[PDB]
Subunit: 125 residues, 4 copies
């Protein structure tokens, strides 16, 4: 990623923010991937809620990552958006974690959602 | 839109929700349009904050509209996402409203953001 | 929608373009809805390809709608993006149509994708 | 990113594809950042076309990255979407490159768009 390099060259120019943007995009891709993998499993009927939560988590994480990319002093929705993203990731983590013993893709995704949750919460500080 | 027709045919199947989805997509398109119009004005330097808020409002409104399209009994991020969208629209409305005397596009956008704010807040009930 | 009203107030200011933007957002919402409905069906394992195509069609249609909202004389990706959106909608229509006898949501979605395909192709002219 | 780890655990499971997904998300974030930086420059009126192209490139790159994340044998829009993304990045590169002597953020962005263009074109093979 080029998050850190772009922040330093912004004419209005933060480690917690860089980590948050990086994680949001990582987590968006991972959740989109996890949903698709779940859709290809024999046992897809057991993964409906997981697929749905991953789709919502991918959407929210892209939005949050985009918003945060534009947050390098003026009033912003950033802190509200990051709280919502943290809650989304917490929910998605919980469901992916439940399937992690059965599907390796869900273990990887649950780990990324946990990290993203932490990153987004830390950037609200 | 086909929001109402699709909700009624969902196997797990709400006027406030239909109005919220419709408005989110209307508002996303309107804000994207408003940002582009502002970017073409002689006086673009006065509209920087407006353009930035419109970009964030378009992103959040698409996300909210998508999430809400998937919310037709299971646990959801919906109510959190709709609160964030309502706050986003309130912020964007305020700035577009400030320019409404000068730019007709901003008057139209401020009106749509006001309506979307109301719709999203009403769907959290 | 406010597509037509916003185009007329753009400082750089087209019926085919308005219809294309409107349809892209309608189709994005419809496909997102169709995927979610398919995910809730008893027979979800038969709908894997449909769900996947709907997810891609929602993503492409939002992108196309956004791009087209910013296309009201300068060089643009618009015509390329609209060709891609037309191909996406054609593919998604074909698969939703295949399930239309079994699931009413897929009949509605197939009809919207057909219309969106036509609209996007007509706006490339 | 977790692109490579997720592809290997997909139940239907490609170096060119991994590089393409990674680059699309990098480029989406970079272009969103570049647009915001341009919007904060004294000389924003000279950067209108650059801002507009960056917004379109961010939208297309997210879409392409998402689609490609779901492309790990069945029929797909992938190759069409990647051609469109390659054309988008070529256009955005050209305009960012034109401003690269004046704005360091545009130099970084032009380099990322060039790389993403190459990656997306290589994944169509
Ligand atoms: Cu995230
Ligand atoms: Cu994620
Ligand atoms: Cu999954
Ligand atoms: Cu997730
Ligand atoms: Cu997420
Ligand atoms: Cu999150
Ligand atoms: Cu986040
Ligand atoms: Cu997540
Ligand atoms: Cu999850
Ligand atoms: Cu998974
Ligand atoms: Cu998962
Ligand atoms: Cu995850
Ligand atoms: Cu997950
Ligand atoms: Cu996440
Ligand atoms: Cu996060
Ligand atoms: Cu809205
Ligand atoms: Cu709006
Ligand atoms: Cu505007
Ligand atoms: Cu707005
Ligand atoms: Cu909005
Ligand atoms: Cu909103
Ligand atoms: Cu909303
Ligand atoms: Cu708004
Ligand atoms: Cu606004
Ligand atoms: Cu405006
Ligand atoms: Cu506005
Ligand atoms: Cu508005
Ligand atoms: Cu506005
Ligand atoms: Cu709004
Ligand atoms: Cu709303
Ligand atoms: Cu469409
Ligand atoms: Cu559609
Ligand atoms: Cu469906
Ligand atoms: Cu579709
Ligand atoms: Cu579509
Ligand atoms: Cu389309
Ligand atoms: Cu289209
Ligand atoms: Cu479609
Ligand atoms: Cu379809
Ligand atoms: Cu359907
Ligand atoms: Cu369908
Ligand atoms: Cu459809
Ligand atoms: Cu469909
Ligand atoms: Cu469509
Ligand atoms: Cu269309
Ligand atoms: Cu790209
Ligand atoms: Cu880019
Ligand atoms: Cu820039
Ligand atoms: Cu760009
Ligand atoms: Cu791009
Ligand atoms: Cu690209
Ligand atoms: Cu690309
Ligand atoms: Cu680019
Ligand atoms: Cu560019
Ligand atoms: Cu830049
Ligand atoms: Cu740039
Ligand atoms: Cu770039
Ligand atoms: Cu750029
Ligand atoms: Cu790019
Ligand atoms: Cu690329
Ligand atoms: Na900002
Ligand atoms: Na749902
Ligand atoms: Na334009
Ligand atoms: Na696929």
């Amino acid at each position: 990623m080029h998050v850190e390099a772009m922040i330093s060259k912004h004419p209005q120019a933060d480690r917690s923010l860089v980590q948050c943007v990086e994680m949001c995009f990582d987590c968006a891709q991972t959740c989109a991937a996890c949903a698709d993998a779940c859709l290809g499993e024999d046992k897809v009927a057991d993964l409906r809620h997981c697929i749905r939560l991953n789709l919502d988590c991918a959407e929210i994480c892209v939005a949050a990552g985009s918003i945060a990319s534009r947050a390098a002093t003026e009033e912003s929705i950033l802190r509200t958006m990051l709280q919502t993203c943290a809650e989304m990731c917490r929910m998605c983590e919980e469901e992916c974690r439940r399937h992690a013993g059965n599907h390796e893709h869900c273990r990887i995704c649950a780990d990324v959602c946990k990290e993203c949750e932490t990153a987004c919460r830390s950037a609200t500080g």
